[PDB]
């Protein structure tokens, strides 16, 4: 019922479990958000995504602003009605994908100019245009527009990028607030930057806290630094953010990354891996990933995972999925993606339960032992 309310139900070390209540639904944390790139979670109907246990999905603003266009989606009734997902949706700012998939990017204090990677170039993206687009889509959780720092980054480089991001954070907050309908029904998350330098991370955290956000994302990670570095940065960075607000780690999704991140105080995750790997033939299991294409699964009657309770593993065998994937059949992608998303959701549930029972430490230890 409320616009945004985060409650921590239980804690264990830095890990915590709770719920985020929003107008469109409740989100159980730690949460994993499946990625909906072009207004669709790859090969899955919304009902199937919900069936796996997902409380919220992420919408890629970059893709949507190009096709079919934020203005058109708004005219059509908003992203929710368009794609058939009635629960909360978090949309990114679009900046990350602009710097990664756009042609001839142009950085400036006002924003970034670019060429669409498919057909001419729907072209200007600033803090306020980003917020406007997210409003047009009608997302529930809006991300502030920032400048991600590449890895590696020199201190001065990371500093200047972080400083710009904080100026943009303020501009994102102001833009969000001017739009009453948006400020009253949506939530705004700020993004901490600063690369791997704790002094920069600290400055970022403070600036962010001074502005004030509904949630805080730890940006600049999973960009080539490796798990060890990521974890080291999380160790000192997360404690810098407000404890009573959700902590969101953007673009982090390997099962072990998630477990280690939750141990360090992260509440939300998102990543394309489950859907992506599904199409590639990689299935996640409690005993590690397996590539279903390999010949040893040709006559394996066991389900993808014998402890998974998803619909796929309750009805089909590895042999069948192996056949579908090697035949390049669409159902192969459908089945693999459903199981993968379900596996992630089950992992999150086990994490939430273990924290609530004060045995998350043992769970993480046992998980790693079996998974590897
Ligand atoms: Zn399954």
UniProtKB/Swiss-Prot annotation:
Keywords: Glycosyltransferase, Metal-binding, Queuosine biosynthesis, Transferase, tRNA processing, Zinc
Cofactor note: Binds 1 zinc ion per subunit.
Effect of residue 146 to A: Abolishes catalytic activity
InterPro entries given in the database record: ArchSynthase1/Queuine_TRR, TGT, TGT-like_sf, tRNA_ribo_trans-like
Reported cofactor(s): Zn(2+)
GO MF term list: metal ion binding; tRNA-guanosine(34) queuine transglycosylase activity
Region spans: RNA binding: 251-257, 275-279
Pfam family, one: TGT
Enzyme class: transferase
Family that this chain belongs to: Belongs to the queuine tRNA-ribosyltransferase family.
Protein name in UniProt: Queuine tRNA-ribosyltransferase
Protein species of origin: Zymomonas mobilis subsp. mobilis (strain ATCC 31821 / ZM4 / CP4)
């Amino acid at each position: 019922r409320p616009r945004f309310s985060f409650s921590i139900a239980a804690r264990e070390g830095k890990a915590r479990t709770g719920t985020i209540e929003m107008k469109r639904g409740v989100i159980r944390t730690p949460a994993f958000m499946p990625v909906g790139t072009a207004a669709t979670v790859k090969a899955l109907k919304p009902e199937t995504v919900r069936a796996t246990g997902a409380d919220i999905i992420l919408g890629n603003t970059y893709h949507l602003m190009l096709r079919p266009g934020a203005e058109r989606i708004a005219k059509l009734g908003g992203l929710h009605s368009f794609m058939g997902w009635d629960r909360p949706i978090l949309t990114d700012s679009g900046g990350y994908q602009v710097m990664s998939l756009s042609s001839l990017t142009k950085q400036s204090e006002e924003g970034v100019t670019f060429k669409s990677h498919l057909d001419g170039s729907r072209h200007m993206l600033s803090p306020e245009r980003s917020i406007e687009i997210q409003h047009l889509l009608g997302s529930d959780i809006v991300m502030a527009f920032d400048e991600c720092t590449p890895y590696p980054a020199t201190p001065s480089r990371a500093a200047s990028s972080m400083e710009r991001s904080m100026r943009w954070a303020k501009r994102s907050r102001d833009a969000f607030d001017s739009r009453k309908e948006q400020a009253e029904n949506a939530a705004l998350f700020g993004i901490q930057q600063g690369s791997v330098f704790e002094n920069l991370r600290q400055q970022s955290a403070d600036a962010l806290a001074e502005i004030g956000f509904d949630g805080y994302a730890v940006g600049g990670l999973a960009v080539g630094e490796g798990q060890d570095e990521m974890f080291r940065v999380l160790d000192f960075s997360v404690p810098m953010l407000p404890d009573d607000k959700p902590h969101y780690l953007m673009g982090v999704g390997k099962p072990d990354d998630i477990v280690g991140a939750v141990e360090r105080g992260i509440d939300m995750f998102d990543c394309v891996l489950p859907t992506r790997s599904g199409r590639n033939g990689q299935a996640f299991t409690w005993d590690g990933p397996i590539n279903i294409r390999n010949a040893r699964f040709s006559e394996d009657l066991k389900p993808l995972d014998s402890e998974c309770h998803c619909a796929v593993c309750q009805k089909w065998s590895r042999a069948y999925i192996h056949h579908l994937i090697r035949a390049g059949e669409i159902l192969g992608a459908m089945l693999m993606t459903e199981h993968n998303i379900a596996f992630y959701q089950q992992l999150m549930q086990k994490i939430r339960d273990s924290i609530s029972e004060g045995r998350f430490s043992q769970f993480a230890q046992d998980f790693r032992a079996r998974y590897f």
